[PDB]
Amino acid sequence: MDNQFIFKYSWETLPKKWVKKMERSEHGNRFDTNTDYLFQLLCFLKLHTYTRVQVLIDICGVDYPSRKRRFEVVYNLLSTRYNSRIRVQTSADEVTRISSVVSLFPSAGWWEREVWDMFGVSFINHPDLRRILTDYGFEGHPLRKDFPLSGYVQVRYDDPEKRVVSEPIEMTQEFRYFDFASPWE
Amino acid sequence: NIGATLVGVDKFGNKYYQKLGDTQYGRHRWVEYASKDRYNASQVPAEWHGWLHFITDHTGDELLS
Amino acid sequence: MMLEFAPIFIYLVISLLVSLILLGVPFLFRFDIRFYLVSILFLIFDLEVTFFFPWAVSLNKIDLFGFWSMMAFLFILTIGFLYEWKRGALDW
Amino acid sequence: SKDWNTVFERSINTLFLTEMVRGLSLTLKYFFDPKVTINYPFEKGPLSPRFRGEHALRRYPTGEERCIACKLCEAVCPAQAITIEAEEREDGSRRTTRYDIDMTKCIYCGFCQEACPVDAIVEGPNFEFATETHEELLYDKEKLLENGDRWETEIAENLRSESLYR
Amino acid sequence: LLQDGPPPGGFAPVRYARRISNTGPSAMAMFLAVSGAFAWGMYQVGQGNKIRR
Amino acid sequence: IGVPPNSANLTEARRRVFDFFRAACRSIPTIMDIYNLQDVVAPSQLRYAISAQIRNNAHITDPKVIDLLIFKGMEELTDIVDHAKQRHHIIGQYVGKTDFLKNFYTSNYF
Amino acid sequence: YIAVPAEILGIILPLLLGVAFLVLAERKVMAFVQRRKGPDVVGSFGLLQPLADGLKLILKEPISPSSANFFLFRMAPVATFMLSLVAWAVVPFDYGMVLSDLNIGLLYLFAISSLGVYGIIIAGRSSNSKYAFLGALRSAAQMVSYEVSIGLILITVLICVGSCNLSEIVMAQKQIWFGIPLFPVLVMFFISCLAETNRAPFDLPEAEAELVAGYNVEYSSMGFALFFLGEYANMILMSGLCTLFFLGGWLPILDLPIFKKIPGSIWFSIKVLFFLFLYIWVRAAFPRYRYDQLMGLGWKVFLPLSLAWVVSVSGLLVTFQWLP
Amino acid sequence: DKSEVTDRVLSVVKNFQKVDPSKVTPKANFQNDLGLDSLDSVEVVMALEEEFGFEIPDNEADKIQSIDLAVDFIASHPQ
Amino acid sequence: SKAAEFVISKVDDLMNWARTGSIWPMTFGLACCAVEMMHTGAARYDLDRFGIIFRPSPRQSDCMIVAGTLTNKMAPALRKVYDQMPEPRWVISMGSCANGGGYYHYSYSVVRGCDRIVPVDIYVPGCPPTAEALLYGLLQLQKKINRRKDFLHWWNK
Amino acid sequence: NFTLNFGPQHPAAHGVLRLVLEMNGEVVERAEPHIGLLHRGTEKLIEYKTYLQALPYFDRLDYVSMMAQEHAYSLAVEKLLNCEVPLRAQYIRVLFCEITRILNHLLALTTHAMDVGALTPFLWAFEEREKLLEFYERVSGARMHASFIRPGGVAQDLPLGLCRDIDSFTQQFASRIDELEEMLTGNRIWKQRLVDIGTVTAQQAKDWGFSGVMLRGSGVCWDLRRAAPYDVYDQLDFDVPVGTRGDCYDRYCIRIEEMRQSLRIIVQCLNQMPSGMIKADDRKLCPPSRCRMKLSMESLIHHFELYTEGFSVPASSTYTAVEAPKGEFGVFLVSNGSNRPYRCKIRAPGFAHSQGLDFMSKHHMLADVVTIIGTQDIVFGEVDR
């Protein structure tokens, strides 16, 4: 019900080969699984009596363009009656299908689509997985570290045809990147 | 138009009045523009701008010193 | 008698002319069924009101017989309206 | 469960719109009370000495401009509105040859005002500077210095007043 | 050295518990004020009808 | 319906590609009907355009990548069919001496 | 006989100006409730604001879509304005200050009130919009539903009077006003008139962009102006009818003091002003009804109750022979 | 009948820019005799369903590898 | 021309007075600037005093205020809304996001100001502009309208 | 079942809300809100600006509870930095968060009522909200978007003549709340337009992630500022209103009681206001006094290196969570160890509330959907980041 008790219990009660690694710290308790035993882990953490994790807060996403498994989706959870927080995360890939958890927590249906939109990590057995945030004709995934901040296409109105047409990006004043990084740190 | 007293004058001719309430805001101090042709919507100088917006308790005549 | 309708007709003509010139000036510069049921209910009670009009005016001439003959009509159509009420034709 | 004495009161109240005339009478109490609106062109709302409005480049009482092209404001501006170009004058000291602010990008957050080591740039209390053309909103150095000169008698007083803080 | 804060002794107490008043017309008397008015008014209408006749 | 799991091998992805092309061809009258384009283009060479775009990316061997292209193509098709994409964009996407001298005359960076 | 159009113009022009000034009246008396002042910059106290609105609508050339039908989409506001104006030909002011002294005045008013439904039906269909057509159809259904309650209350009034002449009804209230005996009937009539004209807690036409957007969502300046004028004229007309039936049309309050020898043309005016003030008060006093519960209310709270009032008044008059 | 529709389904095959009228028979395999690609085969099927109202469902669209089978299926159809 | 100049000057004056005394802006609020824009019309500033009653639809409104950021997906909707308005079509760019880029001005899904579309007559700067700033912008728009010699130009031509 | 396109272009439905839905003629079956029209792109823009430049992003999100939004970012940065903030700063932060709660509740109540049709309390409550936006004008530079709260403490000290005005306001704010409540709670129409509308069970709220008033409108006593108290809230005394039925009326009553409790907490914070400094002193993440950086060398160096480079948060990651007026607002910071955040996801409480609209409008009227939108208090700045 606090950090240490939950750590002991989930170290003993949890079946092995599920949690690839785990951490215990004041910032938060982590359970890094291996991108396949995710539905099982969440289902156990949702239905067990001593860990009644009921509400899924959000489904994060971090793009690391330096590791083989580029992406890393993060599942934030919360147990209302135990008043405790569990943060389960995996490692994804740009061309790979990670399982969805809409069956357990129906609220994930939209964070699922948002994670697909921002990064490009597709999901299985999800009803929609349609773009939710970007434009209808949007291309690429913006929250990837590859995507330029300014983007690839601009939007403007041209009079020859009375409609708003996209066009290649061409900025008046470029985004000045100030390199404040210094040594001795 | 009318009020308690009159607080100073301005080189542009507009007169600044001042009324005092008891506990509720409203009708504290305003400006009667010297002209009438749309009054340009902005004619108060820098000295009287602070007094009009309750920024400073200085009249504006005292702000010169 | 009917001589009081000539001012009404002329008033209608003048109103038409004014309405026409009002909008002539600026140029110088999926299926539902509850609606049909409520419309029939309105038709029935409109007939009720149409029958009510002669009754109320000529009520001193006919006493205790015209009144009850009208109450019988009201009772019949009140039974009909009660049947409409329970059959779910008034609430949505 | 009812006692034939409460159902009468409840039926009557729901039939005579008492709970509606309650609100009807409530809405009328402010009808005869004094109003709160202000005649904006004549009397304006109360501001504070810390108000962040149209920017202004103030200068020393001697006459030298206060900006030394330290570029802290350019490097701290979250909106990246400020663009500065510096050069050593033939006098010898460093000054700005091109200091312009994009008022369309600017968000009036006051970070630039509090980043100056010499209080060169401040946000005057002028909140009425809506223009007709977009290119006029791009405040260059001369317009911003004229703004500083116009509001100096009040900008300096505002800085002196709330100098006990910051 | 001149931090803003509460005055020596603290601020005055404030009520926040949704004070309930009673400015309603009546409870039952309105029923009589309607029914007796209806009866007397119908009698007056009868007298007016007799006069008009 | 729901997103199918990624194909195990290339022969299982090939039938998925054929099914996607089949669905695109089935829905092709709807685009021509709801976007009001009859004289500009005929439905027959839209088949050629779709076939060209689906055969350009024919050298990919990885089943996961092919599945992802099918997924993205389905999203684009659903965007076009539904009232999401806007007119004069479908037609925008669909339907000498030497090159070096032209590129030299137009710009330095080619 | 050439002076009849003079009377007709003397009826029309002051009434159009009355609608124009009633708009300002509501926008000011509703603002005073909400700690505001309303338009006070154009004229003396906004007294020139209606003129400014009218001139602005005269200018600003119409867009005139007319996609479906050139005629009906243009004729519907004309029809509704004519119907709004034509019912004033029978309203009596003091004694002979009435255009037409019809002997079927109540039936004429009932016919005119029920005949205004087309103005928001053909107008609703003419605009090629599902949200306009469906909302206009529902508003028409609401007015049609409350029409029967209006008629039944009219029968209740007619029982006591004994004649359909409008000028005779007011003379029938010499002894007492009809608001004293049958006050609940007056309340029901006022609420029904609120629902009839789409005003105060029933005005779903101005329900912004909900299921009902209004029959006048896509109209040019002048068509929208004509609809607006027509339904505010309907508001004035229904206030006048409500104060003419259940209140003395021109009769003094109680004519006990000596200062009640003033002309009767202003008693009618002040009573109409009182009812307009109640209209605006109810508008800026209560929230709105959803359309589903509005229909159920109008069919299950006002029809049976008005029928019961008809029966009770008729039985009481017949029993004691207090008949005209 | 089959002969009436054969004369019209042979015509549409000439628009594929690969099929030569000198190498077409009522018994002519698309993949083998004509050398058409599998994708070319599905484009041929697509052209077939645009000839008339029938959609050539997915299950039966994989048993028309030869032109005679396609002609027989088209002729023996209600639509 | 001088004989018939008093009449045309009076007609121009009347039209300008009519158009300035009753402007019906359309609340096209998009972001936090819409809060300040609806907050100007509250009981403290009484935007309605100048005959500035708001409108729910663009068919009757003769002016519109772009309050808030303008993303890429809402650009076609803004253009359609602007097209439906009657002939005058005065546009006010309230806020700092609407009148040119804004605090974002760099993200992929943002139109760099409402001047790529819907040509603007008055730019109101601020983030968010003070209610008095929006009032001053409306006064500037009214001053702009007073310079329109509508009848004189059409009579000289 | 025909389909009509909602999506009005005005703040009379909060604006920026497509909401395509299925209609049987009078009863809605499935409503699909199309968010994304306000995806400004803050989450991508966070990673390109230092920890100080990124603070004004948080004011824009959910732009009616301004100081309740940057508070979460400040708490996250403090947790990642092990920075201890003085007591006076904590008390004034709690006070201003309560003021944000009052502002949000007033705006939500009156916007929802005006959506229903009651338009007179709208202007009354904005007249009262003038007095608090004026308080915001006093302490900070701007009325609405005030970057008052910083990771160290608050930006600047309170003015001398502020607490008197705040207490004078709190003297009559309760009577103003009573005036606003008497027009709606006791009214008849308000009850029939809210009762038994959009009922949500506790299991449904937990499954759909409805932390906030929606969770507490189903009988769940989950208050983040009491379950996980961050600032000085243990000292303060207040109650957590909990509803019985998940209809819209009990959510309205809960919001009224929340305004009452916020007034109580403001009074307590005004009474128990200690002296001392406002900015932290343990770590170096606070600017030196402008009367100190002009005569000291180390102070000037710190000013320069803080207003150009900023403070470098040590490499870690965490998820903070505060009780925003809408509900649970959380910031998921990932720090690379440099002066710019690696990834900062923003958990908007309105996102889950908006997705959970589909099952709330299950078999309701179409005009019964605008009241469901109003009762969940959705602003689209937070929904689309």
Ligand SMILES: CCCCCCCCCCCCCCCCCCCC(=O)O[C@H](COC(=O)CCCCCCCCCCCCCC)COP(=O)(O)OCCN
């Ligand atoms: C000085 C001159 C003033 C002239 C104007 C008079 C004042 C008018 C002021 C109007 C202010 C209120 C306007 C609000 C508008 C909407 C109100 C409608 C409310 C409504 O319809 O509720 C109904 C009940 O009220 C009703 O039924 C309403 C009709 C009530 C008639 C009273 C009948 C009593 C009969 C007693 C007879 C006594 C004599 C017997 C011998 C149904 O209620 P619900 O559906 O909401 O709730 C469940 C019930 N199932």
Ligand SMILES: CCCCCCCCCCCC(=O)SCCNC(=O)CCNC(=O)[C@H](O)C(C)(C)COP(=O)(O)O
């Ligand atoms: C208007 C409609 C809107 C949508 C239009 C479509 C938009 C998206 C189009 C999809 C874009 C893609 O590249 S998605 C499809 C890309 N995938 C492939 O090309 C599979 C790899 N190629 C092979 O397997 C074989 O070579 C094959 C050529 C299939 C046959 O040869 P065989 O038989 O020997 O196997």
Ligand code: SF4
């Ligand atoms: S921070 Fe001040 S002194 Fe430094 S460059 Fe900017 S304006 Fe000049």
Ligand code: SF4
């Ligand atoms: S106020 Fe903020 S955005 Fe504007 S110039 Fe100063 S630092 Fe940049």
Ligand code: SF4
């Ligand atoms: S100008 Fe400021 S307040 Fe207005 S939309 Fe842009 S960021 Fe938001």
